Structure 1
Amino acid sequence: VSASSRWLEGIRKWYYNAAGFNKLGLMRDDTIHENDDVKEAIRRLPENLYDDRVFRIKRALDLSMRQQILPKEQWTKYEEDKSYLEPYLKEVIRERKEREEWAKK
């Protein structure tokens, strides 16, 4: 709640800015490494998010190509960073582990 939470939060906000994907207009979940669980979750995204996600990634690849970056104004502010993919991925993991528990019996 107090100084303590803000400190961790500000340590997190610091790394975020240092990680620097926001400079390419990206979002945390856009940088997630695609594995089986991730592929399925990407698959389950509804039309809108999936479309936005592809354009974001395209904007970035395009930048990373000419090794430019976005104007400061358009970086993605921490806070404002939507974990759109998270709930889907969590459910995909939660599903797999169920098969995995079933496979032990």
Structure 2
Amino acid sequence: SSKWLEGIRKWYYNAAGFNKLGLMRDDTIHENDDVKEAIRRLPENLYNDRVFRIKRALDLSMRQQILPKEQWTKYEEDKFYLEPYLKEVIRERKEREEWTK
């Protein structure tokens, strides 16, 4: 049932690897310009925390070294912050397209 799909999700989140460099979900997003608008529109404190986590990740991958066991961001306590903002940017994209057609 629904419990099994969530267990697949938890396995995949552990085997993905971006919890071993301390990152969170909304820090691996590939940039179009919509992503760039969503990154522009952030509140300041989470933007600073984003750049700190990114900079630790680039450091650790520079010396190709994984964080300890204890500092891994465990599943479903990471902040899913970008999906409102990126959702609204894509919504305005669809709005431009449906208005000009």
Identity of aligned residues (%): 97
Aligned match of 2:41 in 37, 41, 44? 44
* Cα distance in 2, alignment partners of residues 75 and 14 from structure 1: 14
Q: Deviations over 1:2-51 (max 9, x none)?
A: xx222111100111111110110001110111111111001111001111
* Cα distance in 1, alignment partners of residues 4 and 21 from structure 2: 26
Aligned length: 100
Large movers: runs of 4+ above 2 Å: none
Secondary structure at the residue paired with 1:32? coil
TM-score (structure 1 length as normaliser): 0.92
> Is 1:29–1:83's contact at 8 Å kept on the other side of the alignment?
yes
* Cα distance in 2, alignment partners of residues 58 and 6 from structure 1: 36
Q: Deviations over 1:42-95 (max 9, x none)?
A: 111100111100001001000011010111110010111111111100000001
* Cα distance in 2, alignment partners of residues 84 and 67 from structure 1: 28
Secondary structure at the residue paired with 2:19? helix
Structure 2 segments unaligned to the other structure (5+ residues): none
Alignment root-mean-square deviation, CA: 0.8
Structure 1 segments unaligned to the other structure (5+ residues): none
* Cα distance in 2, alignment partners of residues 70 and 86 from structure 1: 27
